[PDB]
Coordinates of C-alpha atoms and ligand atoms in Angstrom, one line a residue:
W29 CA -24.7 -10.1 3.0
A30 CA -22.8 -13.4 3.4
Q31 CA -25.8 -15.2 4.9
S32 CA -27.9 -14.2 1.9
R33 CA -26.0 -16.3 -0.6
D34 CA -25.6 -19.0 2.1
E35 CA -29.4 -18.9 2.3
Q36 CA -29.9 -18.7 -1.4
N37 CA -27.6 -21.7 -1.9
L38 CA -29.5 -23.7 0.6
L39 CA -32.6 -22.4 -1.1
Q40 CA -31.4 -23.6 -4.5
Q41 CA -30.7 -27.2 -3.4
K42 CA -34.2 -27.2 -1.9
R43 CA -35.8 -26.2 -5.2
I44 CA -33.7 -28.7 -7.0
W45 CA -35.1 -31.3 -4.6
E46 CA -38.7 -30.1 -5.1
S47 CA -38.8 -29.8 -8.9
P48 CA -38.4 -33.4 -10.3
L49 CA -37.1 -31.9 -13.5
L50 CA -34.2 -30.1 -11.8
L51 CA -33.7 -33.1 -9.6
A52 CA -33.3 -35.4 -12.6
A53 CA -31.0 -32.8 -14.1
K54 CA -28.8 -32.8 -11.0
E55 CA -28.9 -36.6 -10.7
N56 CA -28.6 -37.2 -14.5
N57 CA -31.7 -39.4 -14.5
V58 CA -32.3 -39.7 -18.3
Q59 CA -35.0 -42.3 -17.4
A60 CA -37.0 -39.7 -15.5
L61 CA -36.4 -36.8 -17.9
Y62 CA -38.2 -38.6 -20.7
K63 CA -41.0 -39.5 -18.4
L64 CA -41.4 -35.8 -17.4
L65 CA -40.9 -34.3 -20.9
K66 CA -42.7 -36.6 -23.4
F67 CA -45.4 -38.4 -21.4
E68 CA -46.7 -36.2 -18.5
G69 CA -45.9 -32.8 -20.0
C70 CA -44.2 -30.2 -17.7
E71 CA -42.8 -26.7 -18.0
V72 CA -39.5 -27.3 -19.8
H73 CA -38.6 -23.7 -19.5
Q74 CA -38.7 -24.2 -15.8
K75 CA -36.8 -21.5 -13.8
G76 CA -35.0 -22.6 -10.7
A77 CA -34.2 -20.7 -7.5
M78 CA -31.1 -19.0 -9.0
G79 CA -32.9 -18.3 -12.2
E80 CA -31.4 -21.4 -13.7
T81 CA -32.8 -23.9 -16.2
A82 CA -32.6 -27.7 -16.1
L83 CA -29.8 -27.3 -18.6
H84 CA -27.9 -25.0 -16.2
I85 CA -28.3 -27.6 -13.5
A86 CA -27.1 -30.3 -15.9
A87 CA -24.0 -28.2 -16.6
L88 CA -23.1 -27.6 -13.0
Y89 CA -22.8 -31.2 -12.0
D90 CA -21.1 -32.5 -15.2
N91 CA -24.0 -34.6 -16.5
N92 CA -23.8 -34.7 -20.3
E93 CA -26.5 -37.3 -21.1
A94 CA -29.1 -35.2 -19.2
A95 CA -28.0 -32.0 -21.1
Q96 CA -28.3 -33.6 -24.5
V97 CA -31.8 -34.8 -23.7
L98 CA -32.7 -31.2 -22.6
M99 CA -31.3 -29.9 -25.9
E100 CA -33.0 -32.5 -28.1
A101 CA -36.4 -31.7 -26.5
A102 CA -35.9 -28.0 -26.2
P103 CA -32.9 -26.4 -28.0
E104 CA -33.8 -22.9 -26.9
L105 CA -32.6 -23.4 -23.4
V106 CA -29.0 -22.8 -24.7
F107 CA -29.6 -19.1 -25.3
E108 CA -31.3 -19.0 -21.9
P109 CA -29.1 -17.1 -19.4
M110 CA -29.2 -17.1 -15.6
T111 CA -31.7 -14.3 -14.5
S112 CA -30.8 -13.9 -10.8
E113 CA -28.8 -11.0 -9.6
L114 CA -26.0 -13.3 -8.4
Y115 CA -25.6 -14.9 -11.8
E116 CA -27.0 -12.2 -14.1
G117 CA -25.7 -13.1 -17.5
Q118 CA -24.2 -16.6 -17.1
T119 CA -25.2 -19.1 -19.8
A120 CA -25.1 -22.9 -20.0
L121 CA -21.9 -22.3 -22.0
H122 CA -20.1 -20.6 -19.1
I123 CA -20.7 -23.6 -16.8
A124 CA -19.4 -26.1 -19.3
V125 CA -16.4 -24.0 -20.1
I126 CA -15.3 -23.5 -16.5
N127 CA -15.9 -27.2 -15.8
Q128 CA -13.7 -28.1 -18.8
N129 CA -16.3 -30.4 -20.3
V130 CA -15.0 -30.4 -23.8
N131 CA -17.8 -32.7 -25.2
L132 CA -20.5 -30.4 -23.8
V133 CA -18.7 -27.2 -25.0
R134 CA -18.4 -29.0 -28.4
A135 CA -22.2 -29.7 -28.5
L136 CA -23.1 -26.2 -27.2
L137 CA -21.2 -24.5 -30.0
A138 CA -23.1 -26.8 -32.4
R139 CA -26.3 -25.3 -31.2
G140 CA -24.7 -21.8 -31.7
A141 CA -24.3 -20.5 -28.1
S142 CA -23.3 -16.9 -27.9
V143 CA -19.5 -16.7 -27.3
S144 CA -20.1 -13.0 -26.4
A145 CA -22.7 -13.3 -23.6
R146 CA -21.4 -11.4 -20.6
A147 CA -21.9 -12.7 -17.1
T148 CA -22.5 -9.5 -15.0
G149 CA -23.6 -11.4 -11.8
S150 CA -22.4 -10.2 -8.5
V151 CA -20.4 -13.4 -7.8
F152 CA -18.4 -12.7 -11.0
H153 CA -17.0 -9.4 -9.7
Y154 CA -13.4 -8.6 -8.8
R155 CA -14.0 -8.3 -5.1
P156 CA -12.2 -9.8 -2.1
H157 CA -15.3 -11.8 -0.9
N158 CA -15.3 -13.7 -4.3
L159 CA -12.7 -16.4 -4.3
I160 CA -11.9 -16.0 -8.0
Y161 CA -12.1 -13.5 -10.9
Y162 CA -12.2 -15.0 -14.4
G163 CA -13.9 -12.1 -16.1
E164 CA -17.2 -12.1 -17.8
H165 CA -16.9 -13.7 -21.3
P166 CA -16.6 -17.5 -22.0
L167 CA -13.3 -16.9 -23.8
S168 CA -11.9 -15.5 -20.5
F169 CA -13.1 -18.5 -18.5
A170 CA -11.3 -21.0 -20.7
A171 CA -8.1 -18.9 -20.4
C172 CA -8.2 -18.9 -16.6
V173 CA -8.9 -22.6 -16.1
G174 CA -5.8 -23.5 -18.2
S175 CA -7.7 -25.5 -20.8
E176 CA -6.0 -24.6 -24.1
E177 CA -8.4 -26.9 -26.0
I178 CA -11.5 -24.9 -25.0
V179 CA -9.6 -21.5 -25.7
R180 CA -9.0 -22.2 -29.4
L181 CA -12.3 -24.0 -29.7
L182 CA -14.0 -20.8 -28.6
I183 CA -12.0 -18.6 -31.0
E184 CA -13.0 -21.0 -33.8
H185 CA -16.6 -20.0 -33.3
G186 CA -15.9 -16.2 -33.4
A187 CA -14.6 -15.4 -29.9
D188 CA -13.2 -11.8 -29.7
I189 CA -10.0 -11.3 -27.9
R190 CA -10.4 -7.5 -27.6
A191 CA -13.4 -8.1 -25.4
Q192 CA -13.1 -5.9 -22.3
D193 CA -15.1 -6.5 -19.1
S194 CA -16.6 -4.1 -16.7
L195 CA -13.1 -3.0 -15.5
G196 CA -11.9 -2.5 -19.1
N197 CA -9.7 -5.5 -18.8
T198 CA -8.8 -7.7 -21.8
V199 CA -8.2 -11.4 -21.5
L200 CA -4.5 -10.6 -21.0
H201 CA -5.1 -8.4 -18.0
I202 CA -7.2 -11.2 -16.3
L203 CA -4.4 -13.8 -16.7
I204 CA -2.0 -11.5 -14.9
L205 CA -4.2 -11.5 -11.8
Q206 CA -4.4 -15.3 -11.8
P207 CA -2.5 -17.5 -9.2
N208 CA -1.1 -20.2 -11.4
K209 CA 1.6 -18.0 -12.9
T210 CA 3.8 -20.8 -14.3
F211 CA 1.0 -22.2 -16.5
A212 CA -0.7 -19.0 -17.6
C213 CA 2.3 -17.8 -19.5
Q214 CA 1.8 -20.4 -22.2
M215 CA -1.9 -19.4 -22.2
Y216 CA -0.8 -15.8 -22.6
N217 CA 1.3 -16.6 -25.7
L218 CA -1.5 -18.7 -27.2
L219 CA -4.0 -15.8 -27.0
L220 CA -1.6 -13.3 -28.6
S221 CA -1.2 -15.5 -31.7
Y222 CA -4.7 -14.6 -32.7
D223 CA -3.9 -10.9 -32.7
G224 CA -4.5 -8.7 -35.7
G225 CA -0.8 -8.7 -36.5
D226 CA -0.4 -5.0 -37.0
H227 CA 1.8 -2.7 -34.9
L228 CA -1.3 -0.5 -34.1
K229 CA -4.2 -1.6 -32.0
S230 CA -2.4 -4.6 -30.6
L231 CA -4.0 -6.5 -27.7
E232 CA -1.0 -5.7 -25.4
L233 CA -1.7 -2.0 -26.0
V234 CA -5.3 -2.1 -25.0
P235 CA -5.3 -0.4 -21.6
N236 CA -7.2 -1.2 -18.4
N237 CA -9.7 1.6 -17.7
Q238 CA -7.4 2.5 -14.8
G239 CA -4.8 3.4 -17.4
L240 CA -3.0 0.1 -17.3
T241 CA -1.5 -2.0 -20.1
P242 CA -1.0 -5.7 -19.5
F243 CA 2.7 -5.1 -19.0
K244 CA 2.0 -2.3 -16.6
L245 CA -0.5 -4.4 -14.6
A246 CA 2.1 -7.1 -14.2
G247 CA 4.4 -4.9 -12.3
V248 CA 1.7 -3.2 -10.2
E249 CA 0.1 -6.6 -9.3
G250 CA 3.6 -7.9 -8.4
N251 CA 3.5 -10.6 -11.0
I252 CA 7.1 -11.4 -11.5
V253 CA 6.8 -14.3 -13.9
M254 CA 4.5 -12.3 -16.2
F255 CA 6.8 -9.3 -15.9
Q256 CA 9.8 -11.5 -16.9
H257 CA 7.8 -13.1 -19.7
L258 CA 6.4 -9.8 -20.9
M259 CA 10.0 -8.4 -20.9
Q260 CA 11.2 -10.8 -23.6
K261 CA 9.1 -8.9 -26.2
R262 CA 10.9 -5.6 -25.3
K263 CA 14.7 -6.3 -25.3
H264 CA 17.1 -6.5 -28.2
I265 CA 20.3 -8.6 -27.8
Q266 CA 23.2 -6.7 -29.3
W267 CA 25.9 -9.4 -29.5
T268 CA 27.2 -12.6 -27.9
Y269 CA 31.0 -12.4 -27.0
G270 CA 31.7 -15.7 -25.3
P271 CA 30.0 -15.6 -21.8
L272 CA 29.3 -11.8 -22.2
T273 CA 26.0 -10.9 -23.8
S274 CA 25.3 -7.1 -24.3
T275 CA 21.6 -6.6 -24.4
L276 CA 19.4 -3.5 -25.0
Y277 CA 16.2 -2.6 -23.1
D278 CA 13.1 -0.8 -24.3
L279 CA 12.5 1.5 -21.3
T280 CA 9.2 2.7 -22.9
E281 CA 6.5 1.8 -20.4
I282 CA 9.1 1.9 -17.6
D283 CA 11.1 5.0 -16.6
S284 CA 9.1 8.3 -16.3
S285 CA 7.8 9.2 -19.8
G286 CA 4.2 10.2 -19.3
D287 CA 3.1 11.9 -16.1
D288 CA 1.2 9.0 -14.5
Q289 CA 1.9 6.5 -17.3
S290 CA 5.3 5.8 -15.6
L291 CA 5.6 2.4 -14.0
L292 CA 8.1 3.5 -11.3
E293 CA 5.4 5.8 -9.8
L294 CA 3.0 2.9 -9.7
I295 CA 5.4 0.6 -7.9
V296 CA 6.3 3.0 -5.0
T297 CA 2.7 4.2 -4.4
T298 CA 1.0 0.8 -4.3
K299 CA 0.4 -1.0 -0.9
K300 CA 1.1 -4.3 -2.6
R301 CA 4.0 -6.0 -0.7
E302 CA 4.9 -8.0 -3.7
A303 CA 5.5 -4.9 -5.9
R304 CA 8.7 -4.0 -4.1
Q305 CA 10.4 -6.9 -5.9
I306 CA 9.8 -5.4 -9.4
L307 CA 12.4 -2.7 -9.0
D308 CA 14.8 -5.5 -8.1
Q309 CA 14.5 -6.9 -11.6
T310 CA 17.3 -6.6 -14.2
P311 CA 15.7 -3.8 -16.3
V312 CA 14.7 -1.6 -13.4
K313 CA 17.4 -2.3 -10.8
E314 CA 20.0 -1.1 -13.3
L315 CA 17.9 2.0 -14.0
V316 CA 17.1 3.0 -10.5
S317 CA 20.7 2.5 -9.4
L318 CA 22.1 4.7 -12.1
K319 CA 19.5 7.4 -11.3
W320 CA 20.8 7.3 -7.7
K321 CA 24.6 7.0 -8.0
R322 CA 24.6 10.1 -10.2
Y323 CA 22.0 12.9 -10.3
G324 CA 20.1 11.3 -7.4
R325 CA 22.3 10.9 -4.4
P326 CA 24.2 14.2 -4.7
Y327 CA 21.0 16.4 -5.1
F328 CA 19.5 14.7 -2.0
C329 CA 22.5 16.0 0.0
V330 CA 22.2 19.5 -1.4
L331 CA 18.6 19.8 -0.3
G332 CA 19.5 18.2 3.0
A333 CA 22.4 20.5 3.7
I334 CA 20.2 23.5 2.8
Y335 CA 17.5 22.3 5.2
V336 CA 20.0 21.7 8.0
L337 CA 21.2 25.2 7.6
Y338 CA 17.7 26.5 7.3
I339 CA 16.7 24.9 10.7
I340 CA 20.0 25.9 12.4
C341 CA 19.0 29.4 11.3
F342 CA 15.5 29.2 13.0
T343 CA 17.1 27.6 16.0
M344 CA 19.4 30.6 16.5
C345 CA 16.4 32.9 16.3
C346 CA 14.9 31.1 19.2
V347 CA 17.9 30.9 21.5
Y348 CA 18.4 34.6 20.7
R349 CA 14.8 35.4 21.4
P350 CA 13.7 38.9 22.5
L351 CA 14.8 40.0 26.0
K352 CA 12.8 41.8 28.7
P353 CA 12.7 41.7 32.6
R354 CA 9.8 40.5 34.7
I355 CA 8.0 44.0 34.7
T356 CA 5.5 42.6 37.2
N357 CA 5.4 41.9 40.9
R358 CA 3.5 38.7 40.2
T359 CA 6.0 36.3 41.7
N360 CA 4.4 36.3 45.1
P361 CA 0.7 35.3 44.7
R362 CA 1.3 31.5 44.3
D363 CA 4.9 32.1 45.1
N364 CA 5.8 29.0 43.1
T365 CA 5.7 31.4 40.1
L366 CA 8.9 31.6 38.1
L367 CA 8.2 33.5 34.9
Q368 CA 10.3 36.5 33.6
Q369 CA 8.5 37.5 30.4
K370 CA 10.8 38.6 27.5
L371 CA 8.1 39.7 25.1
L372 CA 8.1 43.5 24.5
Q373 CA 7.4 44.5 20.9
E374 CA 10.3 46.9 20.0
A375 CA 10.8 48.7 16.7
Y376 CA 14.2 48.5 15.2
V377 CA 16.5 48.9 18.2
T378 CA 19.1 46.7 16.5
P379 CA 22.8 46.7 17.4
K380 CA 22.5 43.0 17.0
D381 CA 18.8 42.4 16.5
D382 CA 18.4 42.6 12.7
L383 CA 20.8 39.6 12.5
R384 CA 17.9 37.5 13.7
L385 CA 15.2 39.6 12.1
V386 CA 16.5 38.4 8.7
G387 CA 16.6 35.0 10.4
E388 CA 13.0 35.5 11.3
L389 CA 12.5 36.5 7.7
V390 CA 14.4 33.4 6.5
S391 CA 12.3 31.3 8.8
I392 CA 9.2 32.7 7.3
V393 CA 10.1 32.6 3.6
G394 CA 11.3 29.1 4.1
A395 CA 8.1 28.1 5.9
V396 CA 5.9 29.6 3.3
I397 CA 8.0 27.9 0.6
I398 CA 7.8 24.6 2.6
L399 CA 4.0 25.1 2.8
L400 CA 3.8 26.1 -0.9
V401 CA 5.6 23.0 -2.1
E402 CA 4.1 20.2 0.1
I403 CA 0.5 21.4 0.6
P404 CA -0.1 22.0 -3.1
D405 CA -1.5 18.4 -3.4
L420 CA 7.7 4.9 3.0
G421 CA 8.4 8.6 3.6
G422 CA 5.2 9.7 5.3
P423 CA 5.7 11.4 8.6
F424 CA 8.9 13.0 7.4
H425 CA 6.7 15.1 5.0
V426 CA 3.7 15.6 7.3
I427 CA 6.0 16.9 10.0
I428 CA 7.5 19.6 7.8
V429 CA 4.1 21.1 7.0
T430 CA 3.3 21.1 10.7
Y431 CA 6.6 22.8 11.4
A432 CA 5.9 25.5 8.8
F433 CA 2.4 25.7 10.3
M434 CA 4.0 26.3 13.8
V435 CA 6.4 28.9 12.3
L436 CA 3.5 30.8 10.8
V437 CA 1.6 30.5 14.1
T438 CA 4.8 31.7 15.8
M439 CA 4.6 35.0 13.8
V440 CA 0.9 35.0 14.7
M441 CA 2.0 34.5 18.3
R442 CA 3.9 37.7 17.7
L443 CA 1.8 40.9 16.9
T444 CA -0.5 39.7 19.7
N445 CA 2.3 39.2 22.2
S446 CA 0.4 36.4 24.0
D447 CA 1.8 34.6 27.1
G448 CA 2.3 31.4 25.2
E449 CA 4.9 32.8 22.8
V450 CA 7.2 29.7 23.4
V451 CA 4.4 27.2 22.8
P452 CA 4.3 27.2 19.0
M453 CA 8.0 27.9 18.9
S454 CA 9.1 25.0 21.0
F455 CA 6.9 22.7 18.9
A456 CA 8.6 24.0 15.7
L457 CA 12.0 23.5 17.3
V458 CA 11.5 19.8 17.7
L459 CA 9.5 19.0 14.6
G460 CA 12.1 20.9 12.5
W461 CA 15.1 19.1 13.8
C462 CA 13.8 15.5 14.1
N463 CA 12.9 15.9 10.4
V464 CA 16.6 16.0 9.6
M465 CA 16.8 12.2 10.0
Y466 CA 14.5 12.1 7.1
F467 CA 17.6 12.5 5.0
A468 CA 19.1 9.6 6.9
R469 CA 17.3 7.2 4.5
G470 CA 20.0 8.0 1.9
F471 CA 23.1 7.2 4.0
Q472 CA 23.8 3.5 3.7
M473 CA 24.2 2.8 7.4
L474 CA 21.4 4.5 9.3
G475 CA 19.2 4.3 6.1
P476 CA 17.6 1.1 7.1
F477 CA 17.7 2.3 10.7
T478 CA 15.3 5.1 10.0
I479 CA 12.8 2.7 8.5
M480 CA 13.2 0.5 11.6
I481 CA 12.3 3.3 14.0
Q482 CA 9.5 4.3 11.6
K483 CA 7.7 1.0 11.0
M484 CA 7.9 0.5 14.8
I485 CA 5.6 3.4 15.8
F486 CA 2.5 1.4 14.7
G487 CA 2.3 -2.2 16.0
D488 CA 5.2 -2.1 18.5
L489 CA 4.7 1.3 20.0
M490 CA 0.9 1.7 20.6
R491 CA 1.1 -1.8 22.1
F492 CA 2.7 -1.7 25.5
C493 CA 1.8 2.1 25.9
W494 CA -1.9 1.5 26.1
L495 CA -0.7 -1.2 28.6
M496 CA 1.7 1.2 30.3
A497 CA -0.9 4.0 30.4
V498 CA -3.3 1.6 32.1
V499 CA -0.7 0.6 34.6
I500 CA 0.1 4.2 35.4
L501 CA -3.6 5.0 35.7
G502 CA -3.6 2.4 38.4
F503 CA -0.5 2.9 40.4
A504 CA 0.0 6.7 39.9
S505 CA -3.5 7.6 41.2
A506 CA -2.9 5.4 44.3
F507 CA 0.1 7.4 45.3
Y508 CA -1.9 10.6 45.3
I509 CA -4.4 9.1 47.8
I510 CA -1.4 7.9 49.8
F511 CA 0.3 11.3 49.7
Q512 CA -2.7 13.6 49.7
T513 CA -2.7 12.9 53.5
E514 CA 1.0 13.8 54.1
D515 CA 2.3 17.2 53.4
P516 CA 4.1 18.1 50.1
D517 CA 6.8 20.0 51.9
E518 CA 8.7 16.7 52.1
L519 CA 8.7 14.1 49.2
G520 CA 5.9 15.8 47.2
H521 CA 6.2 13.7 44.1
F522 CA 2.4 13.6 44.0
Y523 CA 1.2 17.0 45.2
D524 CA -1.7 17.4 42.7
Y525 CA -3.3 14.7 40.5
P526 CA -1.4 15.7 37.3
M527 CA 2.0 15.5 39.1
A528 CA 0.8 12.2 40.7
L529 CA 0.6 10.9 37.1
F530 CA 3.7 12.6 35.6
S531 CA 6.0 11.5 38.5
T532 CA 4.9 7.9 38.3
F533 CA 5.3 8.0 34.5
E534 CA 9.0 9.0 35.1
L535 CA 9.1 6.2 37.7
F536 CA 7.9 3.7 35.0
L537 CA 11.1 4.4 33.0
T538 CA 13.4 4.7 36.1
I539 CA 14.4 8.1 34.9
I540 CA 13.5 9.5 38.3
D541 CA 15.4 8.3 41.4
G542 CA 12.2 7.1 43.0
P543 CA 10.6 8.8 46.1
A544 CA 12.9 8.2 49.0
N545 CA 13.2 10.3 52.2
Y546 CA 14.9 8.7 55.2
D547 CA 14.4 11.4 57.9
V548 CA 10.6 11.2 58.2
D549 CA 8.3 8.1 58.2
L550 CA 6.7 7.1 54.9
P551 CA 3.2 5.8 54.8
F552 CA 2.5 2.1 55.3
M553 CA 1.2 1.7 51.8
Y554 CA 3.9 3.5 49.7
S555 CA 6.6 0.9 50.6
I556 CA 4.3 -2.0 49.5
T557 CA 3.0 -0.3 46.3
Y558 CA 6.3 0.8 45.0
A559 CA 7.8 -2.7 45.3
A560 CA 4.9 -3.9 43.2
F561 CA 5.6 -0.9 40.8
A562 CA 9.3 -1.6 40.4
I563 CA 8.5 -5.2 39.5
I564 CA 5.6 -4.6 37.0
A565 CA 7.2 -1.6 35.5
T566 CA 10.3 -3.8 34.7
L567 CA 8.4 -6.9 33.6
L568 CA 6.4 -4.7 31.2
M569 CA 9.7 -3.2 30.2
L570 CA 11.4 -6.5 29.4
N571 CA 8.4 -8.0 27.5
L572 CA 8.4 -4.7 25.5
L573 CA 12.0 -5.5 24.6
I574 CA 11.4 -9.2 23.6
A575 CA 8.1 -8.8 21.8
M576 CA 9.6 -6.0 19.8
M577 CA 12.5 -8.1 18.8
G578 CA 10.5 -10.7 17.1
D579 CA 11.2 -8.9 13.8
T580 CA 14.8 -10.0 13.3
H581 CA 14.3 -13.0 11.0
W582 CA 16.5 -13.6 8.0
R583 CA 13.5 -12.6 5.9
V584 CA 13.5 -9.3 7.9
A585 CA 17.1 -8.8 6.8
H586 CA 15.7 -8.2 3.4
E587 CA 12.8 -6.1 4.9
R588 CA 15.4 -4.0 6.7
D589 CA 17.3 -3.4 3.5
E590 CA 15.0 -3.8 0.4
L591 CA 12.5 -1.5 2.1
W592 CA 15.2 1.1 2.6
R593 CA 16.2 0.6 -1.1
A594 CA 12.5 1.0 -2.0
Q595 CA 12.6 4.3 0.0
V596 CA 15.8 5.3 -1.8
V597 CA 14.1 4.4 -5.1
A598 CA 10.9 6.2 -4.1
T599 CA 12.9 9.3 -3.0
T600 CA 14.9 9.1 -6.2
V601 CA 11.6 9.4 -8.1
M602 CA 10.6 12.4 -5.8
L603 CA 13.5 14.6 -7.0
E604 CA 13.1 13.7 -10.7
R605 CA 9.4 14.9 -10.9
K606 CA 9.6 18.5 -9.5
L607 CA 13.2 19.4 -10.4
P608 CA 13.7 21.1 -13.8
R609 CA 15.2 19.6 -17.0
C610 CA 18.4 21.6 -17.3
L611 CA 19.9 19.1 -14.9
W612 CA 19.3 15.4 -14.6
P613 CA 19.2 14.2 -18.3
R614 CA 16.8 11.5 -19.3
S615 CA 18.1 8.1 -18.4
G616 CA 19.4 5.9 -21.3
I617 CA 20.3 6.9 -24.8
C618 CA 17.8 8.0 -27.4
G619 CA 17.1 5.9 -30.5
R620 CA 17.0 8.9 -32.8
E621 CA 20.4 9.4 -34.5
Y622 CA 20.8 5.7 -34.1
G623 CA 19.3 2.6 -35.7
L624 CA 16.3 2.7 -33.5
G625 CA 13.5 5.4 -33.4
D626 CA 13.1 8.2 -30.9
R627 CA 13.0 5.8 -27.9
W628 CA 15.3 5.7 -25.0
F629 CA 17.3 2.5 -24.4
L630 CA 19.5 1.2 -21.6
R631 CA 22.7 -0.7 -22.4
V632 CA 23.3 -3.5 -19.9
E633 CA 25.7 -6.4 -20.3
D634 CA 26.2 -9.5 -18.1
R635 CA 28.1 -12.8 -17.9
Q636 CA 26.8 -16.3 -17.6
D637 CA 29.3 -18.4 -15.5
Ligands
GD701 GD1 11.9 23.0 51.9
GD702 GD1 19.4 9.5 40.5

């Protein structure tokens, strides 16, 4: 796809070179334009490669004298839009506006160019492969280029500010996505001055078709300067007492009013790295901290203590599993057998068995509750693990009633997934809070690396030992008696957790002594470079990423409790405007001191 526009751009410059009209429009040769138009007559409605006219070419390369000649000899080329799919809708006005050619925009509105002609070309879309996104209307182009003179000059000739594009975005939404944040704020105020002036149907209330007001889009897109500037409209200073200044906050589009209309939900669910800084701002950081200090932090410990007791319940049901002897003379064929199955399905022989039967019941009603609260549908694995645990618990009771050999298989999987999920609640303890995010964000880029390497090193050295020790007998050292144990023993050797094969009575093969020296070296070099490369995330900027991501998790988890829990507890944050001078809106009282 990228080569197409590269081809069509090289194709355009070829057609400009071929057509002497389009060449004179690109080179601003007024001497040749009159020779081509008045003397030896040519097609003045000539269409270029990109569906352009000679006027569109004269507007690209800022050439005013050529454009005026093209309009004095054919004033209908102004209404002419670009016809190609890449520029479907662009007019000669859009090119002059985005080039900030005020004299050409002035002359184009004299001819009466449509200030409402959309530009639906593919290069005008809000896509990553396009370097910019200025919208579709000429009013939106002047707002993005930072030319306040063209903006009002377009409104003078009937430009509509309510004009939404394909994505249902007004000119306000488009400025929020722009890079030059420090200059677009004055442009944002200039556009609002032309509003209707009534409290209803304001331009700041017109939502993006993704359900986003311009204020809401600022926080989602991580636009701090626009969020701060948009916040001036929604805060009421109460009084000024020396350095102290008690101010009131609107809390309308913030907090959690509507289901998905809440902004806090949008900030924690977005993948935008910049959005995590919005909840650190002075309307939100007061809110989220009050929602946590009370009603947030305590309820997280209640659910945690309940889950800790629920798992220690199921743990006891496993350590006190059913009992039964071997009941088979099987421990002689393949005399390495070791099993003593404790699996009989008894019926209510309970001097102390019903104590775990209710524990088996508690483990089931808790697992079906866990399944019926998380499957009806950052903290990711610590909620995918719980549904897999409750899946293993339900398979554990399915492992019963069939009495299969692998009774312990789904039960041992549930015993580890259920416990290691307790450090999910570690994200709300100050100390190991950021620790849990450190071990979590390390499973991706710093765990799969050096394991694909370690796995390839084992695949090499482990299999060699099998060949070396498939000749000798396993009665002696035996670390590699079959190919699976040839791999598993060397894996343990890679982490030095095994003492290394060493027998000093017999004579070891001539290749083991050489290969293990090379193993002890490479298994430690790849163990040290795993330590150093992993470290490389200890910058002073990471000191925030260690903390403000944990706070983002605490803020995200604080929103998790407020949605599902009932309304008898956790009252709405702030104080309602009703029964006060305000009106049925909830406000936060925050005061500060300027030094
Ligand atoms: Gd032996
Ligand atoms: Gd040892």
